[PDB]
Amino acid sequence: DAWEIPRESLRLEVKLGQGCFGEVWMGTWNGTTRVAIKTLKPGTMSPEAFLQEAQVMKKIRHEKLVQLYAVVSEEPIYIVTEYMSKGSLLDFLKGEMGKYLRLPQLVDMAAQIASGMAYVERMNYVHRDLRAANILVGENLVCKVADFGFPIKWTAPEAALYGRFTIKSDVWSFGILLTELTTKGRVPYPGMVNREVLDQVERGYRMPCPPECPESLHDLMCQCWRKDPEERPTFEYLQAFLEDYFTSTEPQYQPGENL
Numbered sequence: 001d002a003w004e005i006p007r008e009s010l011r012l013e014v015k016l017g018q019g020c021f022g023e024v025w026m027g028t029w030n031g032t033t034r035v036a037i038k039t040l041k042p043g044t045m046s047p048e049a050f051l052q053e054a055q056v057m058k059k060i061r062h063e064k065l066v067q068l069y070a071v072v073s074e075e076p077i078y079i080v081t082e083y084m085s086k087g088s089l090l091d092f093l094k095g096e097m098g099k100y101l102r103l104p105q106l107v108d109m110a111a112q113i114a115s116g117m118a119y120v121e122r123m124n125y126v127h128r129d130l131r132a133a134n135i136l137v138g139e140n141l142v143c144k145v146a147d148f149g150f151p152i153k154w155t156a157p158e159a160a161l162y163g164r165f166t167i168k169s170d171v172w173s174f175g176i177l178l179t180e181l182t183t184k185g186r187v188p189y190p191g192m193v194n195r196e197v198l199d200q201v202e203r204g205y206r207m208p209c210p211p212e213c214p215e216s217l218h219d220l221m222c223q224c225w226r227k228d229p230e231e232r233p234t235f236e237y238l239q240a241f242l243e244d245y246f247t248s249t250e251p252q253y254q255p256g257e258n259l
């Protein structure tokens with residue numbers, strides 16, 4: 001394979017996170033390139049399974065999707081990608097940077113996500129787990145979709161009920177992701193547990209306009225949360241709308257205490 005690299009060229013420097021199937025490190029590839037490394041714990045998940053994510057990441061290439069660099073496909077396995085220096089968008093949003101972000105910065109982060117998701121849309125792919133926790137941040141507020149291989153509060157009804165997952169339910173999640181960006185990281189449907197979210201959402205309920213969030217962005221949310229998956233906007237739409245936001249939609253926008 002072209003993506004193969006010598007085990008020697010990889011250095012795992014800082015441990016970044018853990019899971020049941022492996023770990024994620026910051027490190028150095030060929031002694032020069034800062035990379036992110038993800039490992040599989042031999043025996044926990046099947047190699048074939050843990051490699052299905054890298055196989056996918058091979059046919060994908062977009063500036064708003066985390067990029068594969070190399071793999072070591074013989075146990076123990078390592079997948080290598082570019083390194084995002086700020087971690088998940090969810091830790092960023094509720095961390096020290098939280099308090100300085102306003103609408104322009106947040107609507108721009110959203111746009112990029114929609115740009116990456118528009119690419120995913122174009123390729124007829126589905127993500128299935130779009131949400132802030134699965135967006136990585138970089139230098140200068142660069143946001144890239146991550147993880148290409150239950151989150152009920154993020155999942156569209158038809159997908160959680162009848163397993164009908166699509167780019168249109170991905171759009172639903174994006175709608176839920178917009179509340180995360182506007183509440184600076186707060187769990188959707190506050191004080192509601194999974195079971196009553198299903199009931200309520202199936203009964204027509206939708207989260208209201210977050211504090212200081214312009215109505216125009218709440219409407220955009222509500223469009224992504226239409227009951228009929230086909231009514232829901234495309235990503236190519238969502239992308240254009242958010243890039244043009246402060247000219248075409250909210251030109252009279254004044255800074256507030258939080259947004």
Ligand SMILES: Cc1nc(Nc2ncc(C(=O)Nc3c(C)cccc3Cl)s2)cc(N2CCN(CCO)CC2)n1
Binds near residue numbers: 016036053079081147
């Ligand atoms: C969990 C985490 N990841 C970071 N960067 C990453 N880049 C890419 C990642 C990744 O997993 N790639 C990947 C791979 C390798 C395989 C398949 C699929 C994918 Cl997408 S993880 C940075 C970070 N930091 C901790 C907190 N710090 C506080 C600063 O104030 C900043 C730095 N923590």
